[PDB]
Design a protein around this ligand. Structure first.
Ligand SMILES: Nc1nc2c(ncn2[C@@H]2O[C@H](COP(=O)(O)OP(=O)(O)O)[C@@H](O)[C@H]2O)c(=O)[nH]1
Ligand SMILES: [Mg+2]
Lengths: 367, 162
């Protein structure tokens, strides 16, 4: 005469009645300030969200799945749009979106993603629903958030680059100011548990920018080309390269993206008179185009010191004629490397995760 | 972040190991595959002296430039290769180039590198020690490759600058 319920211990699922879905989204996404998770594990919102999805799957409510994910995605997008300048917030949500996607793979039920699961984790996989397509959506969203992250970061650094790389003499913005800023970026991305492979690619991208912007500026300024600026320039790059080693980012590929600017700095110092000096420049400057090498030489301005002759420059143009260099003089400073998002399953267990009171999700029931 | 910054310069024939001495001291790395130095190269490392934080700014190298290279330098490592007697004969020339461009008060350290090459030794320690004493230079034999004495070399020269 009445369908009673079976008693069992917390299984790592979260239940809400369809009426509260708006509030869930508000307290967990829209109104969630990153600093409110000061002292918890990273990406808790991702885990919470997957616990709600498990329960939707458990009850075969395919409508509650679609509504939950669709409402979350729209929530995140709405947050990232209102905070399109905010590097913390963007990084926060890139972290949670990825971890959510990691949970949907690790707990997908597809053997291929579950090779690293513990017996107790395999229990918590989805039973009824194949959410491949939602993973594809979340994957897309993450590309977008990534691109907003690079924007914000480039937007902060760009005004600092030229003054910091060339003008300031160490041997208006100093090189230190750029390092303090990148430090702050690195520290946010770390404290929010953003995948290290993504932290690497972000700094690879920022450094390609520093390369491109500084080199373009060299290629448009006659006053700034000389051996003295080549020296300061090289020292400044070597100071950036040592920063990378200090934060363990020297394998990101960042160093490699600065090769052109390094060769421009060496070009500025090299002898440039004899046939010997011309063979060397062509041997060295493999990452500078013919036009760029030629351009830096025409702009070369001594401090007692002679200028680059026309015959010298025509001797160079002849040797590099054999190689087909691009017609564009300047680099694309806004070029964006396509990112590879890894899959990083965790060892956290759904049944040991409990929501802190500071999140205001008392209306979620632990099942 | 530091309290004093000391410019220290590396000089000596090519192939005697200046760049590997730099890479061994600043980042503890060494390459058997000699990569060319081009123009002036740099590297730094914060070292402790007294209760003071000194940033060792080491310069490295492959005419106006030659003065910018020595100007301001408060220390120098003059390096040769204990396995190649020619690089040691040349030390006199490098000494003259130094004394022409650097401050009289510069602290100078003769460094016989590649001490691991004992079986190939071309420059007896005693001769080189004598030369250094004679010309007021500090002296030490290092191996960038097995790292013997590299730390002590820079430590020593930085401690004599204060
Ligand atoms: N056996 C040995 N070889 C060394 C040592 N230091 C440097 N080398 C080698 O000497 C060559 C030239 O080194 P490098 O640092 O580029 O000489 P540099 O031109 O004075 O800077 C390289 O092949 C190194 O492998 C050492 O302590 N022992
Ligand atoms: Mg070298």
């Amino acid at each position: 005469v009445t369908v009673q319920r079976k008693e069992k211990d917390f299984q790592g699922m979260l239940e809400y009645h369809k009426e509260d879905e708006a509030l869930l989204i508000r307290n967990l996404v829209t109104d969630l300030k990153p600093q409110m998770l000061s002292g918890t594990v990273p990406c808790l919102p991702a885990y919470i969200l997957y616990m709600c999805i498990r329960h939707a799957d458990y009850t075969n409510d395919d409508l509650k799945v679609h509504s939950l994910l669709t409402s979350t995605i729209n929530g995140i997008k709405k947050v990232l749009k209102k905070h399109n300048d905010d590097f913390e917030m963007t990084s926060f949500w890139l972290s949670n979106t990825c971890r959510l996607l990691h949970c949907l793979k690790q707990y997908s039920g597809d053997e291929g993603f579950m090779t690293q699961n513990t017996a107790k984790q395999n229990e918590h996989c989805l039973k009824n629903f194949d959410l491949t397509e939602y993973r594809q959506v979340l994957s897309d969203l993450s590309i977008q958030i990534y691109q907003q992250l690079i924007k914000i970061a480039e937007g902060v650094l760009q005004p600092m680059i030229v003054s910091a790389m060339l003008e300031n003499e160490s041997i208006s913005y100093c090189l230190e100011a750029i390092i303090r800023q990148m430090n702050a970026f690195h520290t946010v991305m770390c404290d929010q548990g953003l995948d290290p492979e993504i932290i690497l690619q972000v700094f690879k991208q920022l450094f390609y920018m520093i390369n491109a912007v500084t080199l373009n500026n060299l290629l448009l300024r006659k006053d700034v080309c000389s051996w003295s600026t080549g020296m300061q320039l090289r020292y400044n790059i070597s100071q950036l390269e040592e920063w990378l080693r200090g934060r363990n980012l020297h394998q990101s590929g960042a160093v490699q993206t600065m090769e052109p600017l390094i060769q421009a700095a060496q070009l500025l110092q090299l002898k440039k008179k004899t046939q010997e000096d011309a063979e060397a420049i062509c041997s060295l400057c493999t990452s500078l185009s013919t036009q760029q090498i030629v351009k830096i030489l025409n702009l070369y301005t001594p401090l007692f010191e002679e200028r680059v002759t026309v015959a010298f420059i025509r001797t160079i143009q002849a040797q590099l004629q054999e190689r087909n260099d691009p017609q564009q003089l300047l680099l694309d400073a806004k070029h964006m490397f396509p990112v590879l998002f890894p899959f990083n399953p965790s060892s956290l267990t759904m049944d040991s995760i409990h929501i802190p009171a500071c999140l205001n999700l008392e209306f979620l029931n632990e099942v | 972040e530091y309290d004093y910054l000391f410019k220290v310069v590396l000089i000596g024939d090519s192939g005697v190991g200046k760049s590997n001495l730099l890479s061994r001291f600043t980042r503890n790395e060494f390459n058997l595959e000699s990569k060319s130095t081009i123009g002036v190269e740099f590297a730094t490392r914060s070292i402790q002296v007294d209760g003071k934080t000194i940033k060792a700014q080491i310069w490295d190298t492959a005419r106006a430039i030659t003065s910018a290279y020595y100007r301001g330098a408060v220390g120098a490592l003059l390096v040769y290769d204990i396995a190649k007697h020619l690089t040691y004969e040349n030390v006199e020339r490098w000494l003259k180039e130094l004394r022409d461009h650097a401050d009289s008060n510069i602290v100078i350290m003769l460094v016989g590198n590649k001490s691991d090459l004992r079986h190939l030794r071309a420059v007896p320690t005693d001769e080189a020690r004598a030369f250094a004493e004679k010309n007021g230079l500090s002296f030490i034999e290092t191996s960038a490759l097995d790292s013997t004495n590299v730390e002590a070399a820079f430590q020593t020269i930085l401690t004599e600058i204060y």
